[PDB]
Subunit: 123 residues, 2 copies
Amino acid sequence: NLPTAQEVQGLMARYIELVDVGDIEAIVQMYADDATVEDPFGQPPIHGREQIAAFYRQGLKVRACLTGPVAASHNGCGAMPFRVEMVWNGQPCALDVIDVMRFDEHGRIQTMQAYWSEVNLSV
Amino acid sequence: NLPTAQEVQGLMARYIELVDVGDIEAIVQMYADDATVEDPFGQPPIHGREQIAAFYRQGLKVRACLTGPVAASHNGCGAMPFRVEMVWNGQPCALDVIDVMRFDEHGRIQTMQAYWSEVNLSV
């Protein structure tokens, strides 16, 4: 159903779990067939599992961790802080993002939006 | 102007500063004359400095701190994690919120949305 505040926290924590192991298939499956992603927020959105799968294959030798609790509401919405530790062109860098997700009546991610820019990068 | 990613970070950090000291007038003035606030997200919004001033007078013996960096984008948007340490009816409690703000072409807060629920309360 539409996640409860408590379920939203669990789903989002689960999502950082999937990204940490890099299980791309399980991630894509957390989304709705026609979800949209806005990462970074301010760029045109990507729509559909096809495109999102592409989007995720492209990005993951990474580890992600939650750097604070998942803030959840009662309307199927949640936001959360986390760090992405990569290794850019030999040089290891870290990115601090904040994701805001909205789930649907099935518990799948209808829409995701990431807030970050070069001000959050530590290279 | 429309804040740069860097200015958005400074404005938002400033906003937690104001809430910590409880300078209600300076906070209200950070908003646009007709901004709207959604706190907690999922409740009807409050519109206008009049209503927002009311909203803030009502809430502040509190201290607020940032518990992670301000994630900012290039389109006048930003989000940030922070903790509110109160003292409810004799009993001291803490609330972990996540705010998402959007600034206008003057650097004022057009819209604010807070994500939190009783799952983020530690009483």
